[PDB]
Amino acid sequence: ENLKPFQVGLPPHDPESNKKRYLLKDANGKKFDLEGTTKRFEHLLSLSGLFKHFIESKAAKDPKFRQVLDVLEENKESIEFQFRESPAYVNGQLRPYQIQGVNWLVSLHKNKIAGILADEMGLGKTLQTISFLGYLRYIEKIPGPFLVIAPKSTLNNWLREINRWTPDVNAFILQGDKEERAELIQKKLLGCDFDVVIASYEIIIREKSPLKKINWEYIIIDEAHRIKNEESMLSQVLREFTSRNRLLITGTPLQNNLHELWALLNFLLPDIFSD
DNA sequence: TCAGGATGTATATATCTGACACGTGCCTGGAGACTAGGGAGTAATCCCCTTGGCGCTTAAACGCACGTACGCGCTGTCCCCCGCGTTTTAACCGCCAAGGGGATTACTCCCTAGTCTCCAGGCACGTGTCAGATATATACATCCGAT
Numbered sequence: 001e002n003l004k005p006f007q008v009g010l011p012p013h014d015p016e017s018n019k020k021r022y023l024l025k026d027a028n029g030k031k032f033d034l035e036g037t038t039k040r041f042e043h044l045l046s047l048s049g050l051f052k053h054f055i056e057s058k059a060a061k062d063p064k065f066r067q068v069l070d071v072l073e074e075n076k077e078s079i080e081f082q083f084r085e086s087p088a089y090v091n092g093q094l095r096p097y098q099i100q101g102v103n104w105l106v107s108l109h110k111n112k113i114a115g116i117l118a119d120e121m122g123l124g125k126t127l128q129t130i131s132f133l134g135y136l137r138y139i140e141k142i143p144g145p146f147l148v149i150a151p152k153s154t155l156n157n158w159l160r161e162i163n164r165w166t167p168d169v170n171a172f173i174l175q176g177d178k179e180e181r182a183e184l185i186q187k188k189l190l191g192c193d194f195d196v197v198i199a200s201y202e203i204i205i206r207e208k209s210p211l212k213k214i215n216w217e218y219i220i221i222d223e224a225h226r227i228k229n230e231e232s233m234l235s236q237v238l239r240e241f242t243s244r245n246r247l248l249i250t251g252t253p254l255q256n257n258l259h260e261l262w263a264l265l266n267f268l269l270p271d272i273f274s275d
Numbered sequence: 276t277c278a279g280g281a282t283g284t285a286t287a288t289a290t291c292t293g294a295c296a297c298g299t300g301c302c303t304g305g306a307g308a309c310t311a312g313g314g315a316g317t318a319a320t321c322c323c324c325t326t327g328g329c330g331c332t333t334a335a336a337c338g339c340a341c342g343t344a345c346g347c348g349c350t351g352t353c354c355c356c357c358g359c360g361t362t363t364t365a366a367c368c369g370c371c372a373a374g375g376g377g378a379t380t381a382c383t384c385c386c387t388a389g390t391c392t393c394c395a396g397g398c399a400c401g402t403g404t405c406a407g408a409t410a411t412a413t414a415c416a417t418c419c420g421a422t
């Protein structure tokens with residue numbers, strides 16, 4: 001009603017323009033970015049020097065990462081929008097711990113790395129993620145795309161809240177028998193008429209081939225312990241998804257083991273926990 | 276008989292994966308001595324099988340003729356099984372937990388088999404008996420088809 005001034009500067013919604021970024025035209029454009037890895041490792045070392053343990057072993061493996069190590073060796077404001085009040089682009093109020101979560105999300109984003117949200121149940125994690133995505137939309141000017149894999153039960157709830165506290169965002173959920181699901185696919189997904197896709201652990205396995213053919217800004221995930229095993233078919237499928245970074249909204253991680261946590265971390269930043 | 280539908284059948288196309296190629300370590304197939312026993316050649320001896328016949332007995336096999344009953348074709352008449360639409364529910368993936376089962380890969384070692392040497396009891400073979408089972412007759416009993 002009054003937060004629309006933030007919407008100024010966004011391009012008009014048009015599938016023809018969205019096809020430029022949504023579809024990844026490069027058939028095999030996936031490649032190891034030296035710059036991103038160097039930035040990640042530089043910041044990681046800056047926080048603490050202990051992380052070289054993985055790095056040196058990985059340099060003992062494939063040496064074209066060892067030369068990245070050498071490059072990072074020889075060469076040696078980003079102000080958080082603290083949002084002391086509730087973000088304007090979201091109609092409603094946010095509690096201070098919610099605000100700190102938002103700031104953590106932003107700070108990790110402008111560091112070319114990510115971070116598992118594992119807050120306790122009931123503390124509006126979905127609110128955190130919707131707020132952060134709205135931050136990317138209004139401030140960072142990346143409307144989409146964003147995959148929001150979640151459990152089938154809460155799909156309606158995620159859609160309800162995302163339409164409630166940020167109505168401007170266009171989003172839908174895949175569902176239904178394969179005929180109407182494919183209708184939605186051909187009409188909006190490959191039509192590039194969205195900003196936030198919502199699916200289920202089953203649909204991701206089902207409709208991967210359409211979802212492969214999109215450069216994914218993030219791949220959000222709801223309660224993540226489902227992904228605790230990295231030999232699970234869902235984990236295998238959720239690795240060919242070309243993507244910039246990822247998020248793992250969850251409850252309590254490390255439920256019955258430590259290797260579990262290793263794989264959970266390996267999902268976010270494979271180039272660090274590669275071994 | 277001809278126009279009206281539903282169903283493979285080709286067409287072209289993006290995707291997945293699992294055949295195909297390549298490099299290493301290990302084991303086993305090949306080269307080379309040595310030897311001993313299995314089999315090939317020989318040569319007695321007895322019994323069976325062959326290919327021509329010949330003559331005789333005696334049932335079966337063949338042919339012929341009524342003459343039924345049954346295999347086959349038609350008709351009828353159900354009734355039961357197929358085609359089709361509509362729900363719904365069970366298979367089919369995906370998961371989670373822990374532990375047991377089964378395959379390897381070494382080590383170890385007992386004990387139980389093979390390998391010999393003697394040596395006597397099996398058991399197989401060649402005989403000489405009897406009795407269990409025919410074959411006839413012979414009287415009895417016991418279905419089957421037509422008055």
Ligand SMILES: Nc1ncnc2c1ncn2[C@@H]1O[C@H](COP(=O)(O)OP(=O)(O)O)[C@@H](O)[C@H]1O
Nearest residue numbers: 092093094095121122123124125126127154222
């Ligand atoms: N004004 C509000 N501020 C913060 N949280 C709220 C507000 N109104 C509702 N919520 C809660 O935020 C929650 C976000 O969903 P959540 O309970 O975290 O589900 P999940 O744990 O599956 O993500 C909702 O359940 C809702 O009860």
Ligand SMILES: [Mg+2]
Nearest residue numbers: 125154222223
């Ligand atoms: Mg949740």
